[PDB]
Amino acid sequence: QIVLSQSPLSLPVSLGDQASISCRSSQSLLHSNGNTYLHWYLQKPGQSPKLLIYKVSNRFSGVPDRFSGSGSGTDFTLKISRVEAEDLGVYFCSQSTHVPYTFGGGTKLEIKRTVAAPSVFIFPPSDEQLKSGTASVVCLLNNFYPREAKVQWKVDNALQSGNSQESVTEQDSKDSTYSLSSTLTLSKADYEKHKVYACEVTHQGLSSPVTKSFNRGE
Amino acid sequence: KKPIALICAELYKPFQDLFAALPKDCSEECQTLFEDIRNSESHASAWSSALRIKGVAYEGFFSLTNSWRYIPEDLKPTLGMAIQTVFPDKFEKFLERTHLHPEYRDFTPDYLMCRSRAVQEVSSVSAVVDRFKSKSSEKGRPIRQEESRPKTESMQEDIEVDELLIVEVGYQTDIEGKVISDIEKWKGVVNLMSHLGIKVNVLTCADNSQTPRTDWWIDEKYVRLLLNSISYLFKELLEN
Amino acid sequence: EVKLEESGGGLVRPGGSRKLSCAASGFTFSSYGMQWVRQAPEKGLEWVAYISSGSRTIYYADTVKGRFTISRDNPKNTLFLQMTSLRSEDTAMYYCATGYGGTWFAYWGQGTLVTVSAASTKGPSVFPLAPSSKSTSGGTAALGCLVKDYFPEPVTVSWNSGALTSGVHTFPAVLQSSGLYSLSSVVTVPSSSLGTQTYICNVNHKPSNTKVDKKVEPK
Numbered sequence: 263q264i265v266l267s268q269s270p271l272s273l274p275v276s277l278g279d280q281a282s283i284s285c286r287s288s289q290s291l292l293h294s295n296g297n298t299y300l301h302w303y304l305q306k307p308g309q310s311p312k313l314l315i316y317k318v319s320n321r322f323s324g325v326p327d328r329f330s331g332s333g334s335g336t337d338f339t340l341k342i343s344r345v346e347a348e349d350l351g352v353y354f355c356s357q358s359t360h361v362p363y364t365f366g367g368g369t370k371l372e373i374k375r376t377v378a379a380p381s382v383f384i385f386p387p388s389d390e391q392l393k394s395g396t397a398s399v400v401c402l403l404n405n406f407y408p409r410e411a412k413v414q415w416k417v418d419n420a421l422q423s424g425n426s427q428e429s430v431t432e433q434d435s436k437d438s439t440y441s442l443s444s445t446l447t448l449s450k451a452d453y454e455k456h457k458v459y460a461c462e463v464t465h466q467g468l469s470s471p472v473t474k475s476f477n478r479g480e
Numbered sequence: 481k482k483p484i485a486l487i488c489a490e491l492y493k494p495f496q497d498l499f500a501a502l503p504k505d506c507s508e509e510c511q512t513l514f515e516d517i518r519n520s521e522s523h524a525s526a527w528s529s530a531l532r533i534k535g536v537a538y539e540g541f542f543s544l545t546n547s548w549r550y551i552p553e554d555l556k557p558t559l560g561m562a563i564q565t566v567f568p569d570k571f572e573k574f575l576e577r578t579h580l581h582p583e584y585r586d587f588t589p590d591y592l593m594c595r596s597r598a599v600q601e602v603s604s605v606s607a608v609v610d611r612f613k614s615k616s617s618e619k620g621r622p623i624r625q626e627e628s629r630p631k632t633e634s635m636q637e638d639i640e641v642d643e644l645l646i647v648e649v650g651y652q653t654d655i656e657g658k659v660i661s662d663i664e665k666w667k668g669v670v671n672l673m674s675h676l677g678i679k680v681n682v683l684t685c686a687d688n689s690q691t692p693r694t695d696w697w698i699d700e701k702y703v704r705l706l707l708n709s710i711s712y713l714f715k716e717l718l719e720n
Numbered sequence: 721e722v723k724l725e726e727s728g729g730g731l732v733r734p735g736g737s738r739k740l741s742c743a744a745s746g747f748t749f750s751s752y753g754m755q756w757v758r759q760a761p762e763k764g765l766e767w768v769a770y771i772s773s774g775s776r777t778i779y780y781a782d783t784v785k786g787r788f789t790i791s792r793d794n795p796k797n798t799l800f801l802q803m804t805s806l807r808s809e810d811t812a813m814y815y816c817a818t819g820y821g822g823t824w825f826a827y828w829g830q831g832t833l834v835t836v837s838a839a840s841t842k843g844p845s846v847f848p849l850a851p852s853s854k855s856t857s858g859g860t861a862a863l864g865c866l867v868k869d870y871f872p873e874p875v876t877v878s879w880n881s882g883a884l885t886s887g888v889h890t891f892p893a894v895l896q897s898s899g900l901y902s903l904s905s906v907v908t909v910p911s912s913s914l915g916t917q918t919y920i921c922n923v924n925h926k927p928s929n930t931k932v933d934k935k936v937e938p939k
Contacts, residue, residue: 263782271726274694284844286722289631293633293636294630294633294641294677295636295639295641295677295827296639297636297638297639299636299822299823299824301824301825303765303825305765310815310828310829310831311757311765311825312828313813313824313826316819316822316824316826317638317822317824320825352764354764354765356765356767356824356825357822358634358636358822359633359634359822360631360632360633360634361632361633361634361769361770361779362767362779362780362781362782363634363755363767363779363823364767365764365765365766366764366769366913367764368764368765381857381860381862383855383856383857383862384853384854384855385845385849385852385854385855385864386854388847388848388849388866390847390852391845391847391866391868392846394845397866398847398866400849400864400866400904401853402862402864402906404862404889404906404908427894427896427902429891429892429893429894429903429904430891430892431889431891431892440889441889441906443891443904444907445866445902454822474854476854606776610776634770634779634823635772635777635820636823637752637772637773637819637821637822637823638819638822638823639819695766
């Protein structure tokens, strides 16, 4: 199959700056009919994809003119001359010269903004859930930038593993931040054998790792 | 017991019916050949003539059935001629890549057509391929078919390209062997065309006298004409 | 205007079968090739199949060969995908698409979600994430709802019947090893409003026809 290699995997860019996304093909995309079927798409969060550029450099009707494409053979580039807030999302190249039609892996365009340290909150399990035999403890990292963050759970200073899951929002269309939930799930029996529940958060916006903790009985 | 000249006498009416239905040039060739049989001095001579009539008549009826122009063998274009005239900008590369297999330039199919832009014109190549595949799939008639394809290229909807259709037909007992040998002969060209970026289809098919009359590659009306004339003649030349 | 509208998605057991349809309008459907593309949740785009205008030329992704069949009905302006021997790896949003003049994907439908799993349909358990001093920062408090162990996806979460939208973060669901989904929704509000404003997370899970309204209070 034709392999399309996009670079970079993620592209932070300030509003108003240019962005350039590379797509490299494992073989030439020049078709024997003389056309080169390399195309560019944007998928905004929660929406279906949208064609931007077809056959290397043809802007699709109605696409804003800040988008353009160039290249030949195996080396292609998508340029956004001046990034706008609506350009947040994942950019894909794809090719239809050869069967199977194939896509690049996607380049996530991230709107750059000033560093924002997370606000860190913790939620003990509800009595309703404990009545059912399980205890989920939620640690919330709210409205932070950039995305890189480390979250770990300690129960009476013992580091937990294999019993927590984490989820991250897409970059917020308005304030360009992320939020992250980390949920620790223990059995009710396990939960009641321990006192201190703590979430430890590392983020470059913080002067030092922040531990948010509560005491079960309290 | 019957002399050959005399064999041609009894078959006067079936062969008149045959000559009346074939295309003009095809009819004339068969008519000359028939007089060669009538005036045959040897059995080998009369058999060879008949074999030729069998192939030439069948191809005239194949043309009629398909509304294609019957082309005498002497006027049939070669592959090299089609490339030079339909794909002139690739002819130089065609020559270079045929240095090891120059016989490819002289390959002369029974039919050598191109999509409507001495190569004949056909409005749709895919339509011809489909009706071949349909009859093969419906009546179990042996065909072979190959399409050139550069690398794993997809067909496209935003541009049209010239293409060739190469067809081999025949009337002979070993139908499977006919189509197997044809597609093998042309396999190297198809791969050549793939490398030149030239779109071609090759089709080969065959009929024999054991095929059900409604199942031939020619109209059943033409089957009765061949069976009543040439095929009877072959019986008479053997039994006498 | 060109519009493609997929239907036929939903829940299928592994090894099962499903037929998708795509209704095309606003252009002469019969003159153009039509395509299917899919996207597994949180993953990239994967082409599925192509069918020429007159159905003579059909291409398939290698991962669906022998299992999926693409077809169309030009008089009815409809494209079909017949899916068989389905596997969990086929769970995805399925889009129909056309180039309206080429093999690129110029127009896309909104997609239809196909979930392949033997998990049984189940509405969520919804638990409060109560505001406390441990969820307060200055004049702001966070609260939310844990939406646990529902199947299949689509769940919608709103707050106060949609009136509360500022500061709401509804996290993507995580597929758990049980085969069920879970997520949380959180919102930050003025701490001054605790005890005077009622906060209710409304959770709607149409696959199970369940709707939960959970009021979230200080504990």
